Amino acid sequence: AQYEDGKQYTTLEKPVAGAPQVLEFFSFFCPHCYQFEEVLHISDNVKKKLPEGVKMTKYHVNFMGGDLGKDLTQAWAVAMALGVEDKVTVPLFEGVQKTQTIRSASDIRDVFINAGIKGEEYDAAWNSFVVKSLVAQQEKAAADVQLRGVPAMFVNGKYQLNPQGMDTSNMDVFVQQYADTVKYLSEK
Numbered sequence: 508a509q510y511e512d513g514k515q516y517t518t519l520e521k522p523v524a525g526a527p528q529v530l531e532f533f534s535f536f537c538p539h540c541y542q543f544e545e546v547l548h549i550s551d552n553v554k555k556k557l558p559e560g561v562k563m564t565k566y567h568v569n570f571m572g573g574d575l576g577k578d579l580t581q582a583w584a585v586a587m588a589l590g591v592e593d594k595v596t597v598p599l600f601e602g603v604q605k606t607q608t609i610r611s612a613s614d615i616r617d618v619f620i621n622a623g624i625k626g627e628e629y630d631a632a633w634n635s636f637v638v639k640s641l642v643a644q645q646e647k648a649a650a651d652v653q654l655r656g657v658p659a660m661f662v663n664g665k666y667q668l669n670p671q672g673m674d675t676s677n678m679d680v681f682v683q684q685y686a687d688t689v690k691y692l693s694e695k
């Protein structure tokens with residue numbers, strides 16, 4: 508067939524009940540994740556190919572970067588609790604990977620401050636039980652599929668995107684194939 512298990516996608520041996528429809532995992536330490544955000548715009552291109560209103564969910568992972576990796580998962584919980592993901596994704600990716608000026612949880616807080624989040628607001632969220640449970644939720648979602656690599660996308664708890672099996676000579680073709688696969692998996 509044109510779309511084949513083991514080419515553009517794989518199938519989880521243990522399908523995940525109740526997962527979000529489109530679920531992405533990333534790390535601010537992950538180089539391909541930087542490209543998915545800054546130059547490929549994978550999430551937006553996937554969104555444009557799915558029906559209006561489909562839930563897309565994006566979570567951070569702990570396994571890259573030791574202490575700071577967990578700090579970044581907690582900061583991503585803060586960003587989701589406050590609804591400021593679009594304000595902080597780029598400066599967090601560039602602080603970690605471009606300028607390497609994020610070395611501590613305080614440097615992470617500086618990114619939010621500079622993006623216009625008030626210090627009081629950030630600190631209250633950071634210490635909140637709502638954010639603790641958002642951290643638990645990110646961990647649970649990743650643990651459900653023993654994730655040991657990012658960037659990762661899962662469709663309906665059942666299918667995992669396989670960019671290894673797509674064409675990467677052309678950035679936009681690659682993005683197309685990826686988003687068209689997500690569309691095919693969602694219609695499955």
Ligand SMILES: COc1cccc(-c2ccc3c(CC(=O)O)coc3c2)c1
Binds near residue numbers: 547675
């Ligand atoms: C073609 O233009 C670009 C630009 C930036 C990153 C990538 C890229 C390639 C492969 C991958 C994989 C799978 C693997 O490791 O082969 C995951 O993310 C990727 C990003 C392509």
